[PDB]
Design an enzyme around this catalytic site. Structure first.
Site: not given
Ligand SMILES: Nc1ncnc2c1ncn2[C@@H]1O[C@H](COP(=O)(O)OP(=O)(O)OP(=O)(O)O)[C@@H](O)[C@H]1O
Ligand SMILES: Nc1ncnc2c1ncn2[C@@H]1O[C@H](COP(=O)(O)OP(=O)(O)OP(=O)(O)O)[C@@H](O)[C@H]1O
Ligand SMILES: Nc1ncnc2c1ncn2[C@@H]1O[C@H](COP(=O)(O)OP(=O)(O)OP(=O)(O)O)[C@@H](O)[C@H]1O
Ligand SMILES: [Mg+2]
Ligand SMILES: [Mg+2]
Lengths: 242, 242, 98, 147, 211, 146, 49, 50, 125, 97
Positions: B28-30, B45
């Site tokens: 995943g993204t932060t 993000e």
């Protein structure tokens, strides 16, 4: 078949390995508890550990309020802890509704127990990997501790401990009631039972504790409360001045 | 074989499936959650894949009720199912008890749904981590929910790829401000550590989305930070990392 | 047969009087404290080999030097048991098939 | 811990109460007991590093008590209590006990007074077996000489 | 060495990032060995080169090691597999002994799946014969000194087949991936082959590279 | 004993033979460091010397207990964790006689030659005693019945 | 079983012969080697001498 | 298989006895030793080895 | 979903049903109980066992009451006994104290409980 | 056992067991003046003891890029990100007694 322990099926040894695997998974939080019966109370102490500074310390908890008389202390993973906390709540509403008095702890031991059997009899339900300690004070049976386990086996206790290092605690409790020669400490107030409990735990686990590393739950007559870190702090000084 | 599913057990206390779900969330993204004095502030993000995109037209922070922000990482489609489910459960509680759901209540519900998906042969445990909070009338709370159905209170939580950069910087923020900080002042802080969490993700370019629920700015609703307030945050962070 | 007739088996399982001798012969050599007891070693695991009873008692005898003490205390003796324990779910204090 | 608020507050108090150490010190002249109480409250610390610092304040102060010929009895009880109070860090307290015995040899006192205090002090550390021991043998042979 | 020709960086097409890392990892701890010591650190022991076949893993390493000059040892990993032990295993032994005399030198193992088995839990097979040249490798890639100046380049088709004792730094510390080509990179590649043959003057290298 | 090559008589007594291999093992310890190897895992350094260094200096403290003098250590763990460094440090710090044996330089082509070294390397250990025998990254003859 | 097997033909072989049982042969001891197989051989050897 | 080990057991019992004769009582015990052995490999289907 | 409705007990190639062969071994891995039938009465006696000696034993029952004339006693598994005692009672009330308004004879009670075991031999799950 | 009486495991370097490793290794190198490790190393876990001395070596590469002779905490915070990233290439999974 190579399938023989994916489902809850006997082995050539006549055993349920599947169920045994639950008991090797009751020790993953690595928390330990000890619970002792006073004369007119029950006391249960458990460790608290937070792995980071960045959690809120209050919410981290293992002692779950089920009835207003029945506390429940959980050894093993917190996902299955919660599912166990919920089911129990459901039966507690259910008993009052149909029988017109509050649920007895004794009866909660058999319901949650029989439910455990049903999870090891379906060939598609995975048993909860939580050992539950149920503490209560009943008027009809007196102060009692009932321990259920992932199999659905249970028995009563005079005192009991749970946790991976729980052998050590068994030494302290065995030695202690050997000297008293009775199943319960003759002490008429809950205060000094919190004081006793912490002492055997300091001896057994080999480490002294602090306010923020304890979690204490106390069953008195007719109410169940948890003490906060502040009330626990008071108790610790009074062991030193005995 | 005993390393393939959820209803299996293995004599190491591992249940390999569920652990594999964290590995999904790790792609995943932060996403961070900053717990402030007045509320909660999320930011995510959002990767800009191509210059073909229509910008600021995908929301990865979806509202549940009118007062519980929800932002998730892991499998994007899979997460959308979990949020829909918590919007059903919020709506059921709103009817039956005629108040907006508490956050420890919203916690119980979601918690149960993902736990469920480890006890049947025919289901897969969801691979998403959620971060959800808001303001209710017992105050602001924040919870992070693991794909294992584990959760705790949190003064700051994160998940995503750049959970490495983000965590160390959240320690920094509770040692900056150990008496907490304002929800207004925290907009600029969410910008700063989302930008730093793109130095584990610098093969692309990204867009920052920030949303807040704080009592003192939004009257306890889950709103987006938008217009000129949002670009002040972008500039602040942009100049520190240059 | 006619080259090898006899097959003398050695079982690890043994019985409850024979774990008691085997603990008891390795305690005849060394010093103990009056605290210490051999009779708290029966209620634990019920399948040990002879080398791992010579092993626990030896490992206890190292733990003994870290307190500094030449008498084996029961604090030392239980901790030694807890390392290299080789735990079973067929043994006593670990059952539900009763 | 979960808060870092104890850390800032504790350390900080240590430096300030050096500056308010002369105001305490004059005050001990008018009444020691009251001054004692103040330094006693101070040494309640929830943060580790600050224990080392706050125990130094008490060491300068107790010199007056130790020298006195009624008040050293009262001193011997307080050493007992310190070890018991929380533990309070196991480095701190084990530095003080020594610094006191060291002070006794230099104060000069009755053969009687010297003996009786020492028995009171060797007794606390009977229920300990940490750094205590090193000192414990040394004051035990100091006491052998006496008898 | 025979002295293999340099192909320089001008018969390479694209692969700028891979060259930059390759010089950084192996060549500059040798030449700036003074500055590695001034800094106070140690050189990294070697560099893993990995990524899908077609990217000119083997080509790059020959060209660049010949350009900059460092004693280029040619070893193909399957040659370490032998049905002899105590003679097949002895090529490994003599491959450090040689290398410490002719030091600083770069030991290029082409493929590292033939001796780079993830297996070390073997059940009923001749894979305990194979792994004795894996184990003997991990011993001399430990210092008992006279290996601080001996390096490793390794090319391999896949990196998911390596032993957990080659995940670790001290063995191959720097871990370089060769990526599938990029827009700019493709155009370059085409021009480097086509330089050799004769073309007409109506060629556009971007057209072919879009398509 | 020596013999003649044409009379075949003992002329004189000679000291024992000592394999050419095992002098490499006594002369690689390099990678040396003090008592402390990697920190914060000091608690495991102190445990190691319980078995090894403590019966080396005084067998007379294991006499008071009446236990067998401790011996035998298995080190096992995740890779890179200074198991191998610690082994170089207990050879350096104490300064007791060491080999050594890599897992795979005691393996020979000739059979009853690979038995020969390891039998004769225990022999060496009884003359040059105290001795520490570090087997390094053994997985070679770790193998099962097969 | 060991005092029948080892110790009885050393003290006198002829005990077998005169009853008219022909003597057992070889002893195989099997088991994990941690079981004190090896230990038993040394125990009766010191004893029979 | 069973009767050869009954005959052997009676002469190991007479061996212990230290009398030359085999007596009728040895054969009460012997019959009982093999019949007991036969049942201790079939209650869990255990082999003649570990 | 679920699709466990296929039998998990099947005939074995050699005959006999494997799962019931496994279950019977398990009964001889348990506690010991016996019953003697007298002319003028019946006795059952069994051992009480627990994990630790500090556990009670008065809060545990291995002789359980079905009817005021009929007790049961087991050997085998504790958890598996507990549920079937309850089901034994439930079927004794619903099919004989509602339809004859009294307790069932011993033969008739036996047979009811034998059906419950039977559907644990037949069917999935 | 008894051939092998003690079985010592050395696990992977702990939360502040890395910090203890960092302090011996920052003596070796040339540095600006760094003692601001502590936050960053705990939350960049994945390191064995040897990879701590690889965060030093890779930080002396980030240093070479800048043209610097000293390990900066600017060099060090780019180094932790990179070293971590290269080891997530393949995993390792191991379990014990
Ligand atoms: N950058 C480049 N410039 C020009 N041609 C290139 C370039 N890279 C590779 N090629 C061409 O591709 C060929 C294949 O390269 P090489 O064998 O070195 O690759 P590899 O990825 O290790 O593959 P394998 O090992 O499977 O043969 C080269 O011989 C060359 O013709
Ligand atoms: N704790 C440490 N501190 C500093 N350097 C270390 C540490 N541990 C190992 N290293 C470095 O890593 C190098 C190789 O690791 P070493 O050979 O000692 O380890 P190991 O755990 O036995 O694993 P392997 O046998 O697979 O190498 C050392 O030469 C040293 O530079
Ligand atoms: N019955 C026992 N009483 C005392 N100590 C015992 C006992 N059984 C075994 N031991 C000890 O355990 C160790 C192993 O026993 P022993 O020397 O007989 O070897 P073994 O099992 O045949 O091994 P291998 O044949 O693989 O070498 C010895 O130190 C022995 O004294
Ligand atoms: Mg090594
Ligand atoms: Mg032997």
């Amino acid at each position: 078949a190579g399938y023989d322990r994916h489902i809850t099926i006997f082995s050539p040894e006549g055993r349920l390995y599947q169920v045994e695997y639950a008991f090797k998974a009751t020790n993953q939080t690595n928390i330990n508890s000890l619970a002792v019966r006073g004369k007119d109370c029950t006391v249960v102490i458990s460790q608290k550990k937070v792995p980071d500074k960045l959690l809120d310390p209050t919410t981290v908890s293992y002692i779950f309020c089920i009835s207003r008389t029945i506390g429940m202390v959980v050894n093993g993973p917190i996902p299955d802890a919660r599912n166990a906390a919920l089911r129990a709540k459901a039966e507690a509403a259910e008993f009052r509704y149909k029988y017109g008095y509050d649920m007895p702890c004794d009866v909660l031991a058999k319901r949650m127990a029989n439910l455990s059997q049903i999870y090891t009899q379906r060939a598609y339900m995975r048993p909860l990997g939580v050992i539950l300690t149920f503490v209560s004070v009943d008027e009809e049976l007196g102060p009692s501790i009932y321990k259920t386990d992932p199999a659905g086996y249970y028995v009563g206790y005079k005192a009991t401990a749970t946790g991976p290092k729980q052998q050590e605690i068994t030494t302290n409790l065995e030695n202690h009631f050997k000297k008293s020669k009775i199943d319960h400490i003759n002490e008429e107030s809950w205060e000094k039972v919190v004081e006793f409990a912490i002492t055997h735990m300091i001896d057994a686990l080999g480490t002294e504790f602090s306010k923020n590393d304890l979690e204490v739950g106390v069953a008195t007559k007719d109410k169940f409360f948890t003490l906060s870190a502040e009330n626990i702090e008071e108790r610790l000084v009074a062991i030193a001045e005995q | 074989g005993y390393d393939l599913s959820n209803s299996v057990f293995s004599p190491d206390g591992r249940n390999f499936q569920v652990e594999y779900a964290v590995k999904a969330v790790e792609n995943g993204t932060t996403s961070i959650g900053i717990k402030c004095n007045d509320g909660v502030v999320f930011a995510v993000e959002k990767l800009i894949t191509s210059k073909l995109l229509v910008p600021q037209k995908n929301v990865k922070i979806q509202v549940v009720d009118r007062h519980i922000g929800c932002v998730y990482s892991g499998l994007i489609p899979d997460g959308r199912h979990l949020v829909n489910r918590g919007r059903e459960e919020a709506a059921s509680f709103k009817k039956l008890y005629k108040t907006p759901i508490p956050i420890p209540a919203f916690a119980d519900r979601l918690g149960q749904y993902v736990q469920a998906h480890t006890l049947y042969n025919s289901v897969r445990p969801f691979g998403v981590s959620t971060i959800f909070g808001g303001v209710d009338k017992n105050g602001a709370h924040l919870y992070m929910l693991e794909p294992s159905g584990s959760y705790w209170g949190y003064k700051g939580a994160a998940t995503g790829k750049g959970r490495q950069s983000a965590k160390a910087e959240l320690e920094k923020l509770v040692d900056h401000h150990p008496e907490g900080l304002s929800a207004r002042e925290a907009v600029k802080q969410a910008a700063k550590i989302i930008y730093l969490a793109h130095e584990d993700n610098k093969e692309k370019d990204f867009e920052l989305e920030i949303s807040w629920c704080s009592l003192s700015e939004t009257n306890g609703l889950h709103k987006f930070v938008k217009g000129d307030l949002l670009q002040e945050a972008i500039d602040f962070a942009q100049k520190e990392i240059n | 047969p006619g080259r090898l007739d006899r097959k003398i088996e050695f079982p690890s399982l043994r019985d409850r009087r024979e774990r008691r001798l085997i603990f008891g012969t390795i305690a005849s050599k060394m010093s103990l404290a009056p605290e210490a007891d051999l009779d708290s070693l029966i209620i634990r695991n019920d399948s040990l080999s002879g080398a791992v009873i010579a092993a626990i008692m030896q490992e206890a005898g190292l733990r003994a030097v870290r307190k500094n003490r030449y008498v084996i205390l029961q604090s030392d003796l239980e901790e030694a048991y807890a390392t290299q324990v080789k735990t079973d779910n067929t043994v006593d204090k670990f059952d539900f098939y009763k | 811990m979960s808060r870092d608020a104890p850390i800032k507050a504790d350390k900080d108090y240590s430096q300030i109460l050096k500056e308010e150490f002369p105001k305490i010190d004059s005050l001990a002249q008018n009444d020691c007991n009251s001054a004692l109480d103040q330094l006693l409250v101070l040494e309640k610390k929830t943060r580790q590093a600050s224990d080392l610092a706050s125990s130094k304040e008490v060491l300068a102060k107790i010199v007056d008590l130790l020298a006195s010929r009624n008040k050293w009895d009262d001193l011997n009880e307080q050493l007992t209590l310190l070890s018991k109070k929380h533990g309070q860090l196991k480095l701190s307290i084990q530095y003080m006990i020594q610094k006191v015995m060291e002070y006794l040899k230099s104060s000069k006192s009755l053969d009687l007074n010297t003996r009786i205090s020492v028995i009171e002090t060797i007794r606390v550390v009977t229920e300990n077996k940490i750094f205590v021991e090193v000192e414990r043998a040394r004051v035990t042979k100091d006491l052998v000489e006496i008898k | 060495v025979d002295e293999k020709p340099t192909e320089t960086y001008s018969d390479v097409g694209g692969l700028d990032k891979q060259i930059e890392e390759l010089v950084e990892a192996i060549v500059l701890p040798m030449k700036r060995a003074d500055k590695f010591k001034d800094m106070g650190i140690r050189a990294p022991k070697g560099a893993l080169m990995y990524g899908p076949p077609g990217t000119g893993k083997t080509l790059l390493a020959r060209a660049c090691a010949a350009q900059t000059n460092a004693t280029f040892l040619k070893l193909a990993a399957p040659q370490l597999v032998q049905m002899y032990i105590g003679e097949g295993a002895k090529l490994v032994r003599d491959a450090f002994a040689l290398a410490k005399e002719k030091a600083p030198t770069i030991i290029f193992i082409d493929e590292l799946d033939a001796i780079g088995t993830k297996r070390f839990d073997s059940e009923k097979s001749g894979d305990r014969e194979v792994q004795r040249t894996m184990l003997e490798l991990l011993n001399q890639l430990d210092g008992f000194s006279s290996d601080d100046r001996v390096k490793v380049l390794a090319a391999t088709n896949r990196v998911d087949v390596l032993d957990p004792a080659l995940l670790r730094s001290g063995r191959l510390d720097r871990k370089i991936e060769f990526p599938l080509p990029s827009e700019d990179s493709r155009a370059q590649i085409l021009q480097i082959h086509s330089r050799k043959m004769t073309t007409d003057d109506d060629i556009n290298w971007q057209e072919l590279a879009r398509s | 004993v020596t013999l003649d090559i044409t009379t075949l008589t003992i002329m004189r007594i000679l000291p024992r033979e000592t394999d050419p291999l095992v002098y490499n093992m006594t002369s690689f310890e390099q990678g040396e460091i003090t008592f402390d190897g990697i920190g914060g895992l000091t608690e495991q350094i102190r445990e190691l010397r319980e078995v090894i260094e403590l019966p080396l200096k005084n067998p007379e403290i294991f006499q008071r207990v009446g236990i067998k003098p401790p011996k035998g250590v298995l080190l096992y763990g995740p890779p890179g964790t200074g198991k191998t460094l610690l082994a170089k440090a207990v050879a350096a710090t104490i300064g007791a006689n060491f080999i050594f044996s890599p897992a795979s330089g005691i393996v020979d082509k000739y059979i009853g030659e690979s038995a020969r070294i390891i039998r004769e390397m225990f022999a060496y250990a009884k003359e040059h005693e105290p001795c520490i025998i570090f087997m390094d990254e053994v997985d070679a003859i770790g193998g099962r019945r097969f | 079983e060991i005092r029948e097997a080892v110790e009885l033909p050393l003290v006198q072989a002829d005990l077998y012969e005169q009853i008219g049982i022909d003597p057992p042969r070889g002893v195989l001891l099997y088991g994990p080697p941690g079981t004190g197989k090896t230990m038993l051989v040394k125990a009766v050897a010191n004893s029979t001498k | 298989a069973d009767v050869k080990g009954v005959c052997t057991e009676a002469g190991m019992y007479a061996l212990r006895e230290r009398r030359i004769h085999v007596t009728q009582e040895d054969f009460e015990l012997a019959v009982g030793k093999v019949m007991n052995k036969n049942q201790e490999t079939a209650i869990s289907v255990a082999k003649l080895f570990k | 979903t679920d699709r466990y409705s296929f039998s998990l007990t099947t005939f074995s190639p050699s005959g006999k049903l494997g799962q019931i062969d496994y279950a019977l071994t398990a009964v001889k891995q348990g506690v010991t109980s016996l019953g003697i039938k007298a002319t003028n009465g019946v006795v059952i006696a069994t051992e009480k066992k627990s994990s630790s000696p500090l556990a009670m034993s008065e809060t545990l029952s291995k002789v359980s009451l079905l009817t005021p004339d009929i007790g049961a006693v087991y050997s085998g598994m504790g958890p598996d006994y507990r549920v079937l005692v309850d089901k034994s009672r439930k079927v004794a009330h619903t099919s004989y104290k509602r339809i004859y308004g009294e307790y069932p004879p011993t033969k008739l009670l036996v047979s009811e409980v034998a059906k419950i075991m039977q559907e644990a031999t037949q069917s999935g799950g | 056992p008894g051939r092998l009486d003690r079985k010592v495991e050395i696990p992977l370097p702990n939360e502040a067991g890395r910090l203890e490793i960092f302090k011996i290794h920052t003596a070796k190198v040339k540095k600006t003046g760094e003692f601001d490790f502590e936050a960053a190393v705990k939350m960049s876990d994945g390191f064995n003891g040897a990879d701590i001395r690889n965060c030093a070596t890779e930080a002396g590469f980030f240093a070479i890029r800048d043209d610097r002779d000293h390990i900066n905490p600017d060099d060090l915070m780019k180094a932790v990100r990179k070293v971590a990233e290269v080891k997530k290439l393949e995993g390792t999974i191991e379990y014990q007694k």
